Design an enzyme around this catalytic site. Structure first.
Site, PDB file in Angstrom:
ATOM      1  N   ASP A  35       0.804  -1.211   0.000  1.00 45.05           N
ATOM      2  CA  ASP A  35       0.000   0.000   0.000  1.00 45.05           C
ATOM      3  C   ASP A  35       0.839   1.264   0.000  1.00 45.05           C
ATOM      4  OD1 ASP A  35      -2.152   1.668   0.066  1.00 45.05           O
ATOM      5  OD2 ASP A  35      -2.644   1.329   2.169  1.00 45.05           O
ATOM      6  N   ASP A 224      -1.182   5.476  -5.659  1.00 46.26           N
ATOM      7  CA  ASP A 224      -1.664   4.638  -4.570  1.00 46.26           C
ATOM      8  C   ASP A 224      -1.995   3.222  -5.022  1.00 46.26           C
ATOM      9  OD1 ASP A 224      -2.731   3.513  -2.330  1.00 46.26           O
ATOM     10  OD2 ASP A 224      -4.562   4.748  -2.333  1.00 46.26           O
TER      11      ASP A 224
END
Ligand SMILES: N#CCCCOc1ccc(-c2ccc(-c3ccccc3Cl)n2Cc2cccc(N)n2)cc1
EC number: 3.4.23.46
Length: 365
Positions: A35, A224
Site C-alpha cells: 500500500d 496509490d
C-alpha cells in the site's frame, strides 16, 4: 537478487496486491497488502471472520510491546490496534530482517476484505501520515535505516490479462530493467507524506480536457497501489466520463456502469473505448510526460467494471493506472518513475505508453 523478487506479488482483482512477509520468531507467514497510499505496517492480530491467519504476538520470542494503542476511523469503518515491534522479513524481497513497528489490529470494522487472501497492510508511504502520528517510523524507513537497502522500491502490477487472479513484482532497493521497456520518466514527489505528484494535463483520446491543471490535483494527486481505481476530483471525473461516453457512443451503457456500480458484459470492443493520457510534471519545470492507459486498464474484469470513479480527496492513481507501467518510487531522489511495463496488457493497435517530454509556456493545489 532482483530475479528472486520477480512475481513476489499476488492478489485478487480489485482486492489489492500482496507480498508474503514473515513476522516474529519463529517466522509467522502473512500476506500483506502493498500500500503506497498509507504508512503503517498493520496486521490482523486477532480472529476475524475474513481472516484465516493472523499475527500472534505471544508466539513471537522477539515481539516487544510498545504499550501504545492506535485507533483508525475512516467513515466506512475502522481499525484499532496495539503498537509493538518485531522482526520482519520479506521472503521474496531483500535477504534481510528488520525490527519494524507493527500495529497489531485487534478489532476492525470493514477493514479486511472477504477472500482477498491478505492479513495485513504494508503502508509504504511516509511517516507524515502514519498513525498515531509521524513518530511511528514506517516499515520502509526502518528497512533502509537498518540495512544497506537503497532507499527505492519499484512496483510492477500486472493485473489479470472466481475473481481474476493478479500478479506483479515489488523490487525493493533497485530497478529491474527487465521489468520495463523504453524510457523511465520521472515526476517529482511534491511532498513526502503520500506519494504526491502533479498532473498538469489530461486528455481522452488526444482530446485535452482543457481544465486549469489545479483541478487535476485538487486537493492532491497521489500514486496509490492500495486503491484499485483511477479516482478523479468531481469536476475532472464528470468531464472524463462525458468525454469517454462520447468516444464510445456506439453501444450505450446504463449510467450505473459509468458510476462504477454495475458490470457490463460481452463474451469486447476495446477500440470503442478511448485511451486516457495523464501528463505528469517533469523533473524540469515546464516539462511533462504522459502515461497513456488503455480500456484494458480502466475496464477491469469481474464482464467488466468501469474502474474510474469520483474522488473528494483529489486524484488517486491506483492500480488501474499502475498496471500499465513499471513504477519506481525513487524516495532517495524524491521522484517517481514511469516506464512501459514488460507485462502490461495491450492489443495489436494500441499500447500503454510513457512518452516525453511535453513542454508548456502552478498546478499544485
Ligand atoms: N488495491 C486495492 C483494492 C483493495 C482495497 O484494500 C484496502 C483495504 C483496507 C484499506 C485501509 C483501511 C484503513 C486504512 C488506513 C487509513 C488511515 C491510516 C492508515 C490506514 Cl492502514 N487503509 C489503508 C488505506 C486506506 C485508503 C487508501 C489506501 N491506499 N490505503 C485500504 C485498502
Amino acid at each position: 537478487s532482483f530475479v528472486e523478487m520477480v512475481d513476489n506479488l499476488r492478489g485478487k482483482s480489485g482486492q489489492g496486491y500482496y507480498v508474503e512477509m514473515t513476522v516474529g520468531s519463529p517466522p509467522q507467514t502473512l500476506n500483506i497488502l502493498v500500500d503506497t497510499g498509507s504508512s503503517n505496517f498493520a496486521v490482523g492480530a486477532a480472529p476475524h471472520p475474513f481472516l484465516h491467519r493472523y499475527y500472534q504476538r505471544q508466539l513471537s520470542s522477539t515481539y516487544r510491546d510498545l504499550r501504545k494503542g492506535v485507533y483508525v476511523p475512516y467513515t466506512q469503518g475502522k481499525w484499532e490496534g496495539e503498537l509493538g515491534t518485531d522482526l520482519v522479513s520479506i521472503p521474496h524481497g531483500p535477504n534481510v530482517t528488520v525490527r519494524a513497528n507493527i500495529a497489531a489490529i485487534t478489532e476492525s470494522d470493514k477493514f479486511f476484505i472477504n477472500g482477498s487472501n491478505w492479513e495485513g497492510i504494508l503502508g509504504l508511504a511516509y511517516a507524515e501520515i502514519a498513525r498515531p502520528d509521524d513518530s511511528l517510523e514506517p516499515f520502509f524507513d526502518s528497512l533502509v535505516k537498518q540495512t544497506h537497502v537503497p532507499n527505492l522500491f519499484s512496483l510492477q502490477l500486472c493485473g489479470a490479462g472466481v475473481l481474476a487472479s493478479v500478479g506483479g513484482s515489488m523490487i525493493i532497493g533497485g530497478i529491474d530493467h527487465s521489468l520495463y521497456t523504453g524510457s523511465l520518466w520521472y515526476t517529482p514527489i511534491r511532498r513526502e507524506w503520500y506519494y504526491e505528484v502533479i498532473i498538469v494535463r489530461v486528455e481522452i483520446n488526444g482530446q485535452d480536457l482543457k481544465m486549469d491543471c489545479k483541478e487535476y490535483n485538487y486537493d492532491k494527486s497521489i500514486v496509490d497501489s492500495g486503491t484499485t481505481n483511477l479516482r478523479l476530483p468531481k469536476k475532472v471525473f464528470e468531464a472524463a466520463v462525458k468525454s469517454i461516453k462520447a468516444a464510445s457512443s456506439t453501444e450505450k451503457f446504463p449510467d450505473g456502469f459509468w458510476l462504477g456500480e454495475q458490470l457490463v458484459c460481452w463474451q469486447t470492443p476495446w477500440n470503442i473505448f478511448p485511451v486516457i493520457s495523464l501528463y505528469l510534471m517533469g523533473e524540469v519545470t515546464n516539462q511533462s510526460f504522459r502515461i497513456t492507459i488503455l480500456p484494458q486498464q480502466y475496464l477491469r474484469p469481474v464482464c467488466y467494471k468501469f474502474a474510474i470513479s469520483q474522488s473528494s480527496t483529489g486524484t488517486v492513481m491506483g492500480a488501474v493506472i499502475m498496471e500499465g507501467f513499471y513504477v519506481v518510487f525513487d524516495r532517495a531522489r524524491k521522484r517517481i518513475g514511469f516506464a512501459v511495463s514488460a507485462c502490461h496488457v495491450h492489443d495489436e493497435f494500441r499500447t500503454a505508453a510513457v512518452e516525453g517530454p511535453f513542454v508548456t509556456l502552478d498546478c499544485g493545489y
